[PDB]
Amino acid sequence: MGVEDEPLLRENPRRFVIFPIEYHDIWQMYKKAEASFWTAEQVDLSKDIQHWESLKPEERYFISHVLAFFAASDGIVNENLVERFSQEVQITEARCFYGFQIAMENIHSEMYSLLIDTYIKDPKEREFLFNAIETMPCVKKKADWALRWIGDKEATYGERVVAFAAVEGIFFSGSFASIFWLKKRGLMPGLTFSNELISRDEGLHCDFACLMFKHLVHKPSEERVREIIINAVRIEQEFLTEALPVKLIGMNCTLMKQYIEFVADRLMLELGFSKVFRVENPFDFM
Amino acid sequence: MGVEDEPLLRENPRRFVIFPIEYHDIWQMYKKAEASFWTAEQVDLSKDIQHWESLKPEERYFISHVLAFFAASDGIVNENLVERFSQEVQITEARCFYGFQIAMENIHSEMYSLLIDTYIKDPKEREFLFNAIETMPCVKKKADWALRWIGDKEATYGERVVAFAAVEGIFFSGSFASIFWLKKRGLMPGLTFSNELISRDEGLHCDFACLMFKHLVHKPSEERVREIIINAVRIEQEFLTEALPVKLIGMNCTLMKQYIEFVADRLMLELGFSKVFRVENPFDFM
Numbered sequence: 001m002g003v004e005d006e007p008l009l010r011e012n013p014r015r016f017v018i019f020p021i022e023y024h025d026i027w028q029m030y031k032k033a034e035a036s037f038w039t040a041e042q043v044d045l046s047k048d049i050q051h052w053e054s055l056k057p058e059e060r061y062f063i064s065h066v067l068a069f070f071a072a073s074d075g076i077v078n079e080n081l082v083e084r085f086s087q088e089v090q091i092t093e094a095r096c097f098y099g100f101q102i103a104m105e106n107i108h109s110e111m112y113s114l115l116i117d118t119y120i121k122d123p124k125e126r127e128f129l130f131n132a133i134e135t136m137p138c139v140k141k142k143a144d145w146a147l148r149w150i151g152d153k154e155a156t157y158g159e160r161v162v163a164f165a166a167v168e169g170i171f172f173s174g175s176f177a178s179i180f181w182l183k184k185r186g187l188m189p190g191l192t193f194s195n196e197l198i199s200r201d202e203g204l205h206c207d208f209a210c211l212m213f214k215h216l217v218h219k220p221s222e223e224r225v226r227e228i229i230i231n232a233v234r235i236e237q238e239f240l241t242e243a244l245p246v247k248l249i250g251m252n253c254t255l256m257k258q259y260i261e262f263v264a265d266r267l268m269l270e271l272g273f274s275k276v277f278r279v280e281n282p283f284d285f286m
Numbered sequence: 287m288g289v290e291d292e293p294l295l296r297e298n299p300r301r302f303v304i305f306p307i308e309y310h311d312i313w314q315m316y317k318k319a320e321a322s323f324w325t326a327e328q329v330d331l332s333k334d335i336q337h338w339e340s341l342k343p344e345e346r347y348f349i350s351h352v353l354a355f356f357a358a359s360d361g362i363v364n365e366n367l368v369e370r371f372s373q374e375v376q377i378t379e380a381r382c383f384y385g386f387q388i389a390m391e392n393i394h395s396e397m398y399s400l401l402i403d404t405y406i407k408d409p410k411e412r413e414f415l416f417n418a419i420e421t422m423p424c425v426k427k428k429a430d431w432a433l434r435w436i437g438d439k440e441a442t443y444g445e446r447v448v449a450f451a452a453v454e455g456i457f458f459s460g461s462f463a464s465i466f467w468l469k470k471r472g473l474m475p476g477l478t479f480s481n482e483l484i485s486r487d488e489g490l491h492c493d494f495a496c497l498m499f500k501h502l503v504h505k506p507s508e509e510r511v512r513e514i515i516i517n518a519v520r521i522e523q524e525f526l527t528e529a530l531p532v533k534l535i536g537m538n539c540t541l542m543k544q545y546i547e548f549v550a551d552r553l554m555l556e557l558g559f560s561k562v563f564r565v566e567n568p569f570d571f572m
């Protein structure tokens with residue numbers, strides 16, 4: 001207590017023995033992840049350049065910045081997995097999932113950097129984008145938020161898994177929606193296809209967070225989860241309307257705000273709680 | 287002094303930023319690991335049972351004990367990567383390699399456990415084999431040796447990388463050769479095919495170890511490495527001639543002893559050192 005009372009977190013002397021499977025729900029999530037393995041090299045980028053050059057300058061600006069934000073945020077997610085989640089969780093089934101998630105984050109990061117390298121030849125612009133955590137004010141709020149949760153020496157796994165579900169599910173939702181908006185406009189097949197793989201993968205990662213949360217005996221209160229989630233929505237809404245505005249690609253900022261709230265509601269429910277915002281999904285393409 | 291002198295181990299604020307790649311040799315090994323991804327589901331075991339039943343009882347004893355040894359050892363390798371190597375190495379390229387190695391070790395353990403479950407239906411025998419670390423004296427020597435290197439608070443990364451190259455390269459070499467002997471004999475295509483995949487991967491994991499060792503500034507002495515490698519050799523030789531004799535599957539115990547020495551020599555050369563034993567490879571099928 002609290003930890004020796006937690007089956008996910010307590011001493012498992014069989015942690016590195018794989019069989020037999022005890023947690024079938026957790027294990028099938030791992031098999032799902034494993035069965036959808038893909039590499040950056042599988043994405044065909046050979047038709048993207050022509051589409052990229054035809055875009056308006058501010059569209060290229062928005063897209064390059066979303067790419068830089070994704071590439072940077074993956075490393076933070078990865079950091080948390082490597083230093084915290086994969087270490088503290090003791091059941092084999094989740095250890096397998098988290099090990100495969102780490103591998104997939106590296107692939108996601110590579111994919112985003114390949115996209116950057118393909119669209120942007122200027123080495124100074126590349127470096128600017130690769131070092132977005134330092135060079136880009138817009139990503140700072142999100143990046144710092146996620147990083148606080150890694151160094152938080154007091155917050156429970158229950159709270160931290162919620163926080164990273166908000167990272168992978170809320171902090172990414174506006175940017176995913178943006179790339180899907182571009183698909184509606186028939187632009188950049190490489191970008192839009194890779195976007196389908198990564199958002200699927202990220203959805204699975206949030207699904208897994210909720211599954212872990214469910215197996216906790218001592219969950220944080222609804223009030224506590226509410227304040228993490230709302231806080232995250234606010235940061236995301238600001239990111240998308242002020243810091244890096246979605247009108248740069250022709251999107252309605254007001255509907256985007258509503259969508260972030262739809263997303264957070266779906267996550268709240270998946271976590272076994274009640275909706276916070278009670279709004280519908282404005283986007284038919286999501 | 288002590289470690290801010292080591293490019294592989296010193297502070298890297300770009301640790302979780304993927305691009306640009308700067309250690310191209312290290313990165314190419316990761317791309318090689320990634321390109322050879324496979325899963326247990328790809329290996330067809332349906333044509334092995336008839337061969338399995340045709341064997342002498344001491345052959346089934348041998349194989350199931352080899353399988354149990356491999357499953358147990360994988361989790362120790364895995365533990366080391368999760369708790370030590372993937373944490374302490376700071377270059378992005380190696381962290382990507384090690385992260386992918388962890389995922390592959392989990393696929394290795396699953397493969398071995400699936401082989402056990404497929405060949406052995408008796409629930410009590412399965413549990414005896416899965417708990418090989420506690421239940422099987424033949425594996426104790428190897429398990430404790432490897433485990434000591436994880437617990438060793440004072441040995442350098444340079445020593446430990448060698449120690450785990452000995453684990454994946456020497457402790458596994460006799461068993462891999464055993465399965466290749468079964469291939470020569472035309473027995474159990476599922477086992478022998480999975481064995482091709484896994485020994486290849488383990489070979490790569492050893493190559494990677496030598497690559498990291500090479501990139502160290504403060505290497506251990508040739509004398510000190512000889513000591514680790516010679517020790518590993520004798521443990522493996524005892525394993526295969528006394529604890530679980532390869533005679534049980536028709537192999538010559540003296541030629542096997544020689545094979546281990548040849549493997550160790552190859553590793554010593556790969557580490558930038560001199561041969562120790564100067565013996566030829568007795569096995570034409572290796």
Ligand SMILES: [Fe+3]
Nearest residue numbers: 168201202205
């Ligand atoms: Fe993710």
Ligand SMILES: [Fe+3]
Nearest residue numbers: 454487488491
């Ligand atoms: Fe290995």
Ligand SMILES: [Mg+2]
Nearest residue numbers: 014015017092
């Ligand atoms: Mg277990």
Ligand SMILES: [Mg+2]
Nearest residue numbers: 300301303378
């Ligand atoms: Mg880096």
